[PDB]
Curated annotation (Swiss-Prot):
The gene is RASSF8. Signal peptide: none annotated. Widely expressed as a 6.2 kb transcript. A 2.2 kb alternatively spliced transcript is expressed exclusively in testis. It comes from Homo sapiens. Residues 8-89 form the Ras-associating domain. This is Ras association domain-containing protein 8. It is linked to A chromosomal aberration involving RASSF8 is found in a complex type of synpolydactyly referred to as 3/3-prime/4 synpolydactyly associated with metacarpal and metatarsal synostoses. Reciprocal translocation t(12;22)(p11.2;q13.3) with FBLN1. The chain holds residues 1 to 82 of 419 of the full protein.
């Protein structure tokens, strides 16, 4: 399938614990990330990537890039945090 040595660490809150993700790059869109995590933790389904800042929650698109979505802020990019939320329940897995 796909593979890439060079990657970036994306800080995203997963189950209360911020889990790092290696491999994600400017190119890698949000859809590729939101799924990567769900697959890493196990269970799979429909997840999303929300950014929390100064008490502001905003949903992102599956076509929008995670690294880029942040770059925007730049100076105040770090302050912004990521939270993987579920927008839909899981289905029949393992048969």
């Amino acid at each position: 399938g796909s593979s890439g040595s060079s990657g970036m660490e994306l800080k995203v809150w997963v189950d209360g614990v911020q889990r790092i993700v290696c491999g994600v790059t400017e190119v890698t869109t949000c859809q590729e990330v939101v799924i990567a995590l769900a697959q890493a933790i196990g269970r799979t389904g429909r997840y999303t990537l929300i950014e929390k800042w100064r008490d502001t929650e905003r949903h992102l698109a599956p076509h929008e890039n995670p690294i880029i979505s942040l770059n925007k802020w730049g100076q105040y990019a770090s302050d912004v945090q990521l939270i993987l939320r579920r927008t839909g329940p899981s289905g029949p897995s393992s048969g």
